[PDB]
Structure formats: structure tokens, C-alpha cells
Design a protein around this ligand. Structure first.
Ligand code: NZ4
Ligand code: NZ4
Length: 171
């Protein structure tokens, strides 16, 4: 059985209990915390690519009103985000299982851009999601996993200073 776990869930949970926020910039901002995933149960000799995308958790715009995030406009359909390919991809199962898979180089933006960076809508809520894609085999296979603990709202600056303070404390 292919097993996927979140590394440092303890920490992500401190962010989640406050309502997590991630900065997006025209050029793209790296995430903190970084999504790091423990994976077991791959074929060590099989060849996999790790993908990351961001599901819009609801159809609404969010706003920070009197120290609290609350839902906003009319329901708008949210198209899926673009996919980020882990730069170690493609790689042997052994490679992916030897250390946590860390998405430290993904950059989040609010502007359609050259490449690399993933465009999100500011003031929307997102749930990170990975796809583990067995490549180069005869038999194609995808396994997906969501990380509720890692949910955030995309912001062009932090609103809740409790988040600002945790970000600095742990970075
Ligand atoms: C929570 C919030 O801020 C908000 C704001 C505007 C509209 C709605 N939801 C609806 O009016 N709906 C949803 C179901 O489909 C049609 C009726 C919610
Ligand atoms: C915030 C807001 O306005 C909202 C949010 C969710 C649902 C709805 N509408 C209903 O719950 N309906 C639609 C009519 O049929 C009965 C159930 C409204």
C-alpha cells in the first residue's frame, strides 16, 4: 500500500488553528511552511514524478473583517490551479522514499507569468494536493493526496499578525 503522510503536521496545525495565509507576489513567493511529504510503499526501481496543485476549497472570496476571516462575494466557479512538477522528477521510488519530498522551490503568484510559478487568486482559500505519477512503465498510474492541515488563504500581505509572528518564529 502506497502511504502518503505530512511531515511536521504539529507545526502546520498551529498555522491552521489561526487560519493560515500564504503571500502571492507578481514574481512569485516561496511557501512557509514548506509542504514536506513522507512516502512509503513505492516500487524502489519504478519511475515517478511528484506533482503539486492547489484546489480552491470553496467558491468564495474571503476578507479580514474585524480581526476575523469571513466569506464574501457571489459563488464563482474556481478552475483548478496549474501543476508544479517537483524538480527531482522524474526519479526512482528509492529517491522519493529516502527523505521527505520537500516542495521548497514552488512559488505562488497572483499574475500569469513565464513558467515555474503557480498563479492563485488572492483572498481565495486553497488546499494543497499532490499527484504521484508512475511514468515510463507500460501501466500509467496516478495516486492523489490532499493535505487539509496545509489549507491557506492566498494574500498579497498578511492580515492576522498571529500568522506573521508564527512565520518569523519558525522560519
Ligand atoms: C457565504 C457567502 O458569503 C455567500 C455569499 C453569496 C452567496 C452565497 N451562496 C448562495 O447564495 N448560494 C449558494 C448555493 O447556490 C446558490 C445559492 C454565499
Ligand atoms: C449565504 C446564503 O445566502 C446561502 C448559502 C447556502 C445556501 C443558500 N440557499 C439554500 O440553502 N437553499 C436554496 C433554496 O432552496 C433551499 C435551500 C443560501
Amino acid at each position: 500500500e502506497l502511504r502518503v503522510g505530512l511531515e511536521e503536521s504539529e507545526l502546520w496545525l498551529r498555522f491552521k488553528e489561526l487560519t493560515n495565509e500564504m503571500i502571492v507576489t507578481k514574481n512569485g513567493r516561496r511557501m512557509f511552511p514548506v509542504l514536506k511529504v513522507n512516502v512509503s510503499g513505492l516500487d524502489p526501481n519504478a519511475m515517478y514524478s511528484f506533482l503539486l496543485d492547489f484546489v480552491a476549497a470553496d467558491n468564495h472570496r474571503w476578507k479580514y473583517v474585524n480581526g476575523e476571516w469571513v466569506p464574501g462575494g457571489k459563488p464563482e466557479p474556481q478552475a483548478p490551479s496549474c501543476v508544479y512538477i517537483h524538480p527531482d522528477s522524474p526519479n526512482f521510488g528509492a529517491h522519493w522514499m529516502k527523505a521527505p519530498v520537500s516542495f521548497s522551490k514552488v512559488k505562488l503568484t497572483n499574475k500569469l507569468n513565464g513558467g515555474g510559478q503557480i498563479m492563485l487568486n488572492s483572498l481565495h482559500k486553497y488546499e494543497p494536493r499532490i499527484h504521484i505519477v508512475r511514468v515510463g512503465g507500460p501501466q500509467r498510474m496516478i495516486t492523489s493526496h490532499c493535505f487539509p492541515e496545509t489549507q491557506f488563504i492566498a494574500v498579497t500581505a498578511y492580515q492576522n499578525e498571529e500568522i506573521t509572528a508564527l512565520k518569523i518564529k519558525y522560519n
